[PDB]
């Protein structure tokens, strides 16, 4: 993960190829395809050793990533609806799981 300024312990994971995500109904799939660019393609997290397990890492990674993406989005005069946050939560959760596995693999590799 990359560190800069004042992340207060947080690190920025590398950009991930955006996955094709299906949300289970016609309206949401389309909405997502059209809006997915508005959600993060990388996540913020504290070092993996600072959490009890995956779930706690993921829960946190999701909250900070979304919180901090929301302020940058707010700064640009844009807003997230309940659908946006639901969808963002989901894709950020996926990336946070991937990040955990990558981080925990490195944590195992000395």
């Amino acid at each position: 993960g990359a560190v800069v300024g004042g992340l207060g312990g947080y690190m920025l994971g590398s950009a991930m190829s955006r996955p094709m995500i299906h949300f289970g109904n016609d309206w949401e799939d389309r909405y997502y395809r059209e809006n997915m660019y508005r959600y993060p393609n990388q996540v913020y997290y504290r070092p993996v050793d600072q959490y009890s397990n995956q779930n706690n890492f993921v829960h946190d990674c999701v909250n900070i990533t979304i919180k901090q993406h929301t302020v940058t989005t707010t700064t640009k005069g844009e807003n997230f609806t309940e659908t946006d946050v639901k969808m963002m939560e989901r894709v950020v959760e996926q990336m946070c799981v991937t990040q955990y596995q990558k981080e925990s693999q490195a944590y195992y590799d000395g």
Partner: antibody
Amino acid sequence: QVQLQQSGTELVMPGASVKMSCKASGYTFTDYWMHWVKQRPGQGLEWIGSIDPSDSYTSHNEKFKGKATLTVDESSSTAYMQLSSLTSEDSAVYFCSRSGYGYYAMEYWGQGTSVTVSS
Amino acid sequence: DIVLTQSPAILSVSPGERVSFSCRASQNIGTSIHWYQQRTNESPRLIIKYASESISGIPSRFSGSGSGTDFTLSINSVESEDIADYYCQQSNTWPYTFGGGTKLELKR
């Protein structure tokens, strides 16, 4: 050819839980949503909930949130639905089904699991 | 939620006859309606998807039409094997909902 294999019957005590399986084959398991549908004797179809096997993201009929827990096992291409605190209201056939790729007609159906709750 | 109302509840039909039955949604769902056939003691079977799109292996006598709220499933020439309950379902938005069903019945 795709198949969804479900156990035929479950006999379960009032207040107990049951976990029923839906084993998929003949396609890439994580590419398609799985769905669970309830049918009471002589009544219509009721959607319980659905799951994306890729990340186990779910959606529920509000009435079944807290009643029906949906999971998958990717290794075995199997979807599960656990129903808790069963009553005679839960006596029904429960179908699993699979939709298309980014399309949500229920293209394939299991044979359904018939649940009888009785002491 | 999107309420799907199917009419009639029961339809008496004579073999060979062309029959139709309707599914109407309480809100616009574009073409996001799907029709299932359920014979007695069997699982439902998809017979038309997205209002009008045919399904492989399903007899060509089955067709669907409609877009928006009013949807119609038609059977060009009804056969004994078509005697079943027919359900519509919408997949436009959560929750998925089903119509209450149309039961086909042989007229005698």
